[PDB]
Structure formats: structure tokens, C-alpha cells
Amino acid sequence: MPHAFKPGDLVFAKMKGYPHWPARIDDIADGAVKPPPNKYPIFFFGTHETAFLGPKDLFPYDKSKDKYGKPNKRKGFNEGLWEIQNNPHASYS
């Protein structure tokens, strides 16, 4: 059965106005800004942007890839698909 989300989990993450987007739950570095309560730091592959989201917007990647893992014209998306499939735990700083 499912656990709660933890750092390193792979997802598609949903933001208003954007397609479900390949992403990971990030760690929070020592000294770095923490998310608001009940929110996770989401790193978006391809764009390399961070936003804070709750579970309602997080779709586990394995379950969801058949639906959401297709090319999209949006900037950074297809780069993001490569990253989540081929090196999802790398440093992209």
C-alpha cells in the first residue's frame, strides 16, 4: 500500500494552466527555505523550476506515465520527459 510522499519520489505535478508535468519531490538543503505546511518542494524537470504543491496535484509517475508521458509543445517539457526517464535523481543546478 502507498506511503506518504518522500524526497526522491517521481511524479507528474499539476499547476494551473500547464499540462501534468514530469517532476520530483525535492529535498530541502540545510539552510534553504522550507515549504509552507502540508506542501512539498517540487522540482520540475526540463524547466528546472521549483514550486510548492500538496498531494492533490501530485500523480505518482509509474501509475501515470502512460497517460501523461507524451511529448508536449510546451517549453522544457520534452527535456523534462528525458530527465525523469533517464536521470531523475541527478543534480540539475
Swiss-Prot record:
**Tissue and organ distribution:** Widely expressed. High expression is found in heart, skeletal muscle, ovary and testis. Overexpression is frequently observed in hepatocellular carcinoma samples.
Give the top-rank taxon of the lineage listed in the UniProt record for this protein: Eukaryota
PWWP domain segment(s): 7-64
**Cell location:** Nucleus; Cytoplasm
**Assembly description:** Interacts with HDGF. Interacts with trimethylated 'Lys-36' of histone H3 (H3K36me3). Interacts with trimethylated 'Lys-79' of histone H3 (H3K79me3), but has higher affinity for H3K36me3. Interacts with IWS1. Interacts with H2AX, POGZ, RBBP8 and CBX1. Interacts with histones H3K9me3, H3K27me3 and H3K36me2. Interacts with DPF3a (isoform 2 of DPF3/BAF45C). Interacts with SMARCA4/BRG1/BAF190A, SMARCC1/BAF155 and SMARCD1/BAF60A in a DPF3a-dependent manner.
What's its job?
Acts as an epigenetic regulator of myogenesis in cooperation with DPF3a (isoform 2 of DPF3/BAF45C). Associates with the BAF complex via its interaction with DPF3a and HDGFL2-DPF3a activate myogenic genes by increasing chromatin accessibility through recruitment of SMARCA4/BRG1/BAF190A (ATPase subunit of the BAF complex) to myogenic gene promoters. Promotes the repair of DNA double-strand breaks (DSBs) through the homologous recombination pathway by facilitating the recruitment of the DNA endonuclease RBBP8 to the DSBs.
Family to which this protein belongs: Belongs to the HDGF family.
The name under which this protein is listed is Hepatoma-derived growth factor-related protein 2
In its UniProt entry, the species of origin is given as Homo sapiens (Human)
Q: From which residue to which, out of the full length, is covered?
A: 1 to 93 of 671
